[PDB]
């Protein structure tokens, strides 16, 4: 019916998808090894849209996880949520990889394991006779998720041409350049494949993570154990129309169709306010829906590093405001009434704009059926500031003679560096041209 195959790949893409499947059992009322609660069918009306359909009421995840590093998968099998995963769909015990840290490693390893990489991931494709598409849950940081992920964006474009492609990709961190220095090279090589060899992306910045991780979360030493908490909730938040029973844009080709203006303009800004557990003691007094979307357009919950004074000459075109759970829908048109009076979104002068609001009932659970949740999927034309940030860090590195002799020994014979530079400037010029 609407079966999606997630493509978890890389050192960071496997960990953000590990707790994504772990989030799904707590809201479906199911255990990874059994069914102890009856809340799975009376409370939740649809479960076989991301999981594989049941053979013994055991909803297998439709997931594949490949990585060169064996460290990310050795921290999985000792956890009690790995018995839900199957040891025959992806790998058996003692799976390995390369050495290995290179973008050209996984780019060259795709055609030497070409027979095996297109054998076991295609067995899940013909399980349903109407496949939705493929989401590449991969990474941009490092050479593991960026090297091999650029290969599958090409060969799955023609072997599966009538399928939706759209990824939840995480952006790397640009604070210092000591541990990694190959960051401007492997990022722009995948970013070219994300626009012409891929339809849509969902950007997730790393410098904007610790802006939120010290905002309300109150940590002193930033660890990697907090990167899975902001990411796994908004992943399950994006499929609330798709997993839980909704009516309009209840498919993944429903939501993405109403937000993309044009190809190579698909970078969607994400926002999510409620992350604090001591808000729970004051939501008993009928906290309404009239105050939760006034702060979405206000740049506080954003996960995109952008300029603060560059929003006057940029214009919103498509903005999504997803409320979940208890909505009190007699005032949801009242919340959309107050949008035109502030004009917090700059509107495009050539065409109409749209503020789309939708709702779906959440899990039968006490932290879910009590507190209001707001998921934002914006589309603003100030996203070229990240593309100006990455390009200015790209041409400055090529004048310092950095990784021009250390990178072209394997499988690179011609200069494909300006092939990425002009196509990035094509994106940056057509964005500002789009508001005439």
């Amino acid at each position: 019916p609407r079966e999606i195959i997630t493509l978890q790949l890389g050192q960071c893409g496997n960990q953000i998808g590990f707790e994504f499947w772990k989030q799904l059992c707590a809201e479906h009322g199911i255990s990874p090894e059994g069914i102890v609660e009856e809340f799975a069918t009376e409370g939740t009306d649809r479960k076989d849209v991301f999981f594989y359909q049941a053979d013994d009421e055991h909803y297998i995840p439709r997931a594949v996880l490949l990585d060169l590093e064996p460290r990310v998968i050795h921290s999985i099998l000792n956890s009690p949520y790995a018995n839900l995963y199957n040891p025959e769909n992806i790998y058996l015990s003692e799976h390995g990889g390369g050495a290995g840290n290179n973008w050209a490693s996984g780019f060259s390893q795709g055609e030497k394991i070409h027979e095996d990489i297109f054998d076991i991931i295609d067995r899940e494709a013909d399980g349903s006779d109407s496949l939705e598409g493929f989401v590449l849950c991969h990474s941009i940081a490092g050479g593991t998720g960026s090297g091999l992920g650029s290969y599958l964006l090409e060969r799955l474009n023609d072997r599966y041409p009538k399928k939706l492609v759209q990824t939840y990709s995480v952006f790397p961190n640009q604070d210092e350049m000591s541990h990694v220095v190959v960051q401007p090279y492997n990022s722009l090589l995948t970013l070219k494949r994300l626009t012409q060899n891929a339809d849509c992306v969902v950007v997730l910045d790393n410098t904007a993570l610790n802006r939120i991780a010290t905002d309300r979360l109150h940590i002193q030493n930033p660890s990697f154990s907090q990167i899975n908490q902001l990411v796994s909730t908004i992943m399950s938040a994006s499929t609330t129309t798709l997993r839980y029973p909704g009516y309009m844009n209840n498919d993944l080709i429903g939501l993405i169709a109403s937000l993309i203006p044009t190809p190579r303009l698909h970078f969607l800004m994400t926002g999510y306010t409620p992350l604090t557990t001591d808000q729970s003691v004051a939501s008993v007094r009928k906290t309404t829906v009239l105050d939760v979307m006034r702060r979405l357009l206000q740049p506080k919950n954003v996960m995109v590093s952008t300029g603060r004074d560059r929003q006057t000459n940029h214009c919103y075109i498509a903005i999504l405001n997803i409320i979940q759970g208890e909505v009190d829908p007699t005032q949801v048109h009242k919340s959309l009434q107050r949008i035109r009076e502030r004009k917090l979104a700059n509107f495009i002068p050539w065409g109409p704009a749209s503020i789309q609001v939708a709702l779906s009932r959440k899990s039968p659970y006490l932290p879910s059926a009590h507190r209001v949740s707001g998921l934002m999927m914006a589309n603003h034309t100030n996203i070229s500031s990240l593309f100006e940030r990455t390009c200015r860090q790209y041409d400055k590195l090529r004048k310092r003679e950095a990784f021009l002799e250390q990178f072209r020994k394997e499988d690179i014979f011609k200069d494909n560096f300006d092939e990425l530079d002009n196509s990035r400037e094509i994106v940056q010029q057509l964005i500002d041209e789009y508001h005439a």
Partner: protein, 72 residues
């Protein structure tokens, strides 16, 4: 096609198998209805309907007039 009288039964068993592969949470909620369709105007769409018949005394809340008002 232009509609014929056998297409009523064919679209019916198709809605059967469609609601059946979905895995409804109640198997007996599925055959509680059938579907009905005009004679042959031009096309089958915008000429089809639904018969959901109703048991004991709930039918005093649903007269056979107003199920056409829901079906239209």
């Amino acid at each position: 096609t232009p509609p014929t009288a056998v297409t009523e039964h064919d679209v019916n068993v198709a809605f059967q198998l469609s609601a059946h592969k979905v895995l409804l949470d109640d198997d007996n909620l599925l055959p509680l209805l059938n579907l009905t369709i005009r004679e042959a105007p031009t096309s089958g769409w915008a000429a089809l309907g639904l018969s959901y018949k109703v048991q004991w005394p709930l039918h005093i809340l649903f007269t056979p007039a107003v199920l056409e008002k829901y079906n239209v």
